[PDB]
């Protein structure tokens, strides 16, 4: 059972690689990959693309056909339409699933299979399955979505101020990385101060992508992340660039604004707490609305509050090697009295530093 | 044949690698490595150890002796009286020599028929004596400015891994620089502890060889008192003063006189002053103000930033605060070399160009 240790280690790795092809367009649904082996050859493969599309497990079987009978299904997440009938119907001995269902009492999916004679197992490379759905996994376990907070800084610790979205991030390669990260998030969040001062679009520009351009992401599949903008004071206007983009835009409001907005604009009402809009109840609310993940593009004040409230799951920090002085204000300021470094990479002439809440 | 300029890439590498063995203890002299090859076997090896210890060649040639006659002598840097008598039939120096009035010592051997051919792997030779080379070409010693920061600019209270990392960097420098402001607030030793090194512990750096960097304190107003720990450590500690102090100091305390400039000591003169003083390299340990000033007077050759995974208070100070540094957009800019993990910290290396 050591050969199969490696043998399974391989198909499962493939089944995960497949799952990610869906990472840009799958929200609010998890990513899921499926690989079906018969007598040591892959007879059917599949993964989740769009939200209203049929499951990975199903493409895999519709491709494998009669050849599914013999043996093995590597799935990325415990299977469970009726989707478990589907698997029985085709006739597979053995399924090896990476992680069992995130929610509680629904962890029984495998038992249903065991019952029909199928051999099962869970746990293999589970740690990576976990990584593949950080957001949707957290949403299910806790109320909330996974918040990523991106900061850009110069060596001397300063940033930007009133300069235009285009100058958020200096270098081409860094700009290009940020697009890539935005492109996988469910929502992008931003303050009203930022919209006011910068008139941004906060969209993913498809041209600015590397060789994911081929991966999935045909230009027409392009899915624009949901723009969430905060403002108690209803200061933003129907003419601002941010509401004219394709894609939904959502306002977190403290009280209903009366003006005409286009059909793709919604408002969420949030209670006030010690002066301004209750950040924590926004996060739950967005969780009730199925936001898996929220990528923050804010100034200092907002990044400050999010961190103080302890709602930030990861920090993506971009340092540029340039020095500044006064024009552009500091990067945080914090009175109160948490983090750990994960990946650090070069991004052309900038470095990118990932930190994680854990 | 071109296996000659391929067999050479091997032997010179041994020569460079030997030289390094001396970085900790060599100052104010340069690092130098020599490998004497005959018929395929290295018959003699040597490298510069202490301040006034036998040249690399002297050990390399005593070791080789009679068997020096036949073949090649790979040097790191150009030599000169014992090489000719021992009678080698080819040298390969790595770099011409900085000092640039001289540079005819390699030819002086072509003179004695001995074949020559410099320039090999020169890239790394330069890199081996950054300070010395810098100090020879300009009047100015090489400056590494350490910066400890939290996630949000702002300033040590970084890891022990970081403490041990700086120890090894400290050990490689000729001199350490701090402000009186740091001495007062932290009463430091700014020494090198041998027990904090890792596997330099062995290759050279034997415990009793341990050489303490020179301690330089910028102290305009003579605020630092003769009973602080910094002056009671083993080694020399030199005070940069705007005017003579009248107290009785321990015997290891010297004091360099520097003129005032717009309130404070003039850092540019001080650096030139230290170059006349024979200092190759200065490791700078202080808070944001001095750092701001060094960056702004364009005096810093490289940057070592440690970030810590921590947020500090508002009343924390950092480069991000600080009024004076408006024209920093105009001082010489930097570029990222290497980034790496240090325990729970990252260390980011920035360099000149
Ligand atoms: N990466 C970059 O270089 C980059 C990116 C984005 C923005 N920026 C710059 O940042 C600047 C804006 O900075 P800023 O500090 O003025 O504003 P901000 O941080 O962008 O947003 C402040 C807003 O956030 C909300 N907020 C603040 N504290 C809160 C709290 N404690 N609890 C709940 N909500 C809170 C408030 O919104 P309401 O009052 O509307 O309720 C407040 O007006 C702009 O000039 C922009 O150019 C730079
Ligand atoms: N090395 C480290 O990573 C480390 C370790 C422990 C503590 N610290 C922190 O460092 C902090 C130091 O605070 P700080 O920023 O006020 O002091 P600092 O930058 O370390 O030193 C300021 C001193 O530098 C000199 N100076 C400043 N500007 C100058 C200029 N333009 N030209 C010539 N000389 C100039 C002055 O010395 P004179 O008095 O002689 O005029 C001044 O008092 C401490 O509070 C401590 O907590 C840092």
Active site residue B302: no
Boundary (domain end) residue, out of A133, A158, A179: A133
B151 and B235 share one domain: yes
Phi, psi (degrees; rounded to nearest 5) at B242: -85, -25
Strands A314-320 and A146-154: parallel
A212 and A318 share one domain: yes
Residues A128, A16 contacting (CB under 8 angstroms): yes
Length of chain B as a residue count: 353
Boundary (domain end) residue, out of A117, A133, A149: A133
- Using the mean position of ligand 1's atoms as its centre, give its distance from the Cα of residue A325 in Å: 20
A206 and A343 share one domain: yes
Look up the CATH number of the domain holding residue A23.
3.40.140.10
Whose tokens are 């020095």? That residue is A323
The CA-atom distances, in angstroms, between B216 and each of A349, B175, B180 are 34, 7, 10
Comparing C-alpha atoms, which of B251, B175, B257 is closest to residue B219?
B257
Q: Catalytic residue, from A45, A53, A57, A260: name it.
A: A57
Q: B149, B298, B300, B309: which to substitute to probe chain A, counting the most A Cβ within 10 Å?
A: B309
Residue B19 is part of which domain span? 1-129
Q: Determine if the peptide bond prior to B124 is cis (ω within 30°).
A: no
B25 and B141 share one domain: no
Look up the CATH number of the domain holding residue B205.
3.40.430.10
Boundary (domain end) residue, out of B83, B114, B129: B129
Name residues whose C-beta falls within 8 Å of residue B2's C-beta, 6 or more positions apart in sequence. Answer: none
A111 and A175 share one domain: no
Contact residues, chain B, for A349 at CB < 8 Å: 335-336
B182 and B62 share one domain: no
B239 and B92 share one domain: no
Phi, psi (degrees; rounded to nearest 5) at A261: -115, 165
Residues A51, A29 contacting (CB under 8 angstroms): yes
Which residues are bridge partners to A317 per DSSP? Answer: A151, A353
**Experimental method, per PDB record:** X-ray
Distance CA A154, CA A316 (A): 14
Flag if A331 and B320 touch (Cβ within 8 Å). yes
Q: B161, B305, B306, B311: which to substitute to probe chain A, counting the most A Cβ within 10 Å?
A: B311
Flag if A332 and B307 touch (Cβ within 8 Å). no
Distance CA A357, CA A342 (A): 10
Distance CA B26, CA B333 (A): 31
CA B1 from centre of chain: 39
Helix A300-309 × helix A279-288 angle, to 10°:
80
A231 and A169 share one domain: yes
Name residues whose C-beta falls within 8 Å of residue A207's C-beta, 6 or more positions apart in sequence. Answer: none
Sheet holding A187-191, edge to edge: A265-269, A249-253, A226-230, A187-191, A293-296, A146-154, A314-320, A350-356, A340-347
B82 and B33 share one domain: yes
Q: Which atom of ligand 1 is nearest to the CA of A278?
A: 33
DSSP annotation string for B57-125: HHHHHHHHGGGGSSS-EEESB----HHHHHT-S-EE-SB---------TTHHHHHTT------TTHHHH
Residues B241, B258 contacting (CB under 8 angstroms): yes
B31 and B148 share one domain: no
Take atom 18 of ligand 2 and give the residue whose Cα is closest: B287
B235 and B286 share one domain: yes
Flag if A344 and B341 touch (Cβ within 8 Å). yes
A146 and A109 share one domain: no
Name residues whose C-beta falls within 8 Å of residue A6's C-beta, 6 or more positions apart in sequence. Answer: none
Whose tokens are 């910066």? That residue is B147
Distance CA B264, CA A306 (A): 42
For residue A154, the ligand closest to its alpha carbon is 1
Residues A210, A181 contacting (CB under 8 angstroms): no
Which residues are bridge partners to B56 per DSSP? Answer: none
Cα of first residue to Cα of last residue in chain B, in angstroms, is 38
Residues B33, B17 contacting (CB under 8 angstroms): yes
Domain count, chain A: 2
CA-based Rg of chain B, rounded to a whole angstrom?
Answer: 23
């Amino acid at each position: 059972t050591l050969y199969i240790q490696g043998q399974d280690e391989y198909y499962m790795a493939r089944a995960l690689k497949l799952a990610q092809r869906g990472r840009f367009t799958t929200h609010p649904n998890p990513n899921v990959g499926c690989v079906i082996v018969k007598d040591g050859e892959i007879v059917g493969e599949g993964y989740h693309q769009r939200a209203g599309e049929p499951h990975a497990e199903v493409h895999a079987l519709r491709m494998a056909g009669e050849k599914a009978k013999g043996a093995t299904a590597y799935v990325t997440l415990e299977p469970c339409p009726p989707c478990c009938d589907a698997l029985i119907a085709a006739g597979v001995a053995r399924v090896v699933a990476s992680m069992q269902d995130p929610n509680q009492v629904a962890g029984r999916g495998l038992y249903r299979l065991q019952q029909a004679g199928i051999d099962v197992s869970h746990g293999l490379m589970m740690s990576e399955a976990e990584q593949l759905n950080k957001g949707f996994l957290k949403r299910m376990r806790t109320g909330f979505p996974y918040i990523q907070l991106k900061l850009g800084a110069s060596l001397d610790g300063r940033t930007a101020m009133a300069s235009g979205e285009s100058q958020w991030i200096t270098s081409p390669q860094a700009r290009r990385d940020v697009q890539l990260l935005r492109a996988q998030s469910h929502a992008i969040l931003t303050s009203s101060a930022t919209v006011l001062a910068d008139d941004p679009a906060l969209t993913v520009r498809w041209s600015e992508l590397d060789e994911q351009t081929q991966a999935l992401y045909p230009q027409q599949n392009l899915r624009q992340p949901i723009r969430i903008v905060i403002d108690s004071q209803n200061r933003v206007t129907p003419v601002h660039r941010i509401v004219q983009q394709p894609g939904e835009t959502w306002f977190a409001r403290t009280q209903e604004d009366s003006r005409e907005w286009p059909e793709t604009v919604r408002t969420l009402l949030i209670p006030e707490h010690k002066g301004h809009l209750d950040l924590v109840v926004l996060m739950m609310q967005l969780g009730k609305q199925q936001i898996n993940s929220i990528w923050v593009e804010a100034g200092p004040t907002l990044a400050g509050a999010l961190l103080q409230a302890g709602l930030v799951d990861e920090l993506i920090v971009y340092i540029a090697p340039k020095l500044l002085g006064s024009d552009a204000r500091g990067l945080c300021t914090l009175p109160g009295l948490q983090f750990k470094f994960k990946e650090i990479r070069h991004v052309g002439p900038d470095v990118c530093l990932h930190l994680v809440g854990a």
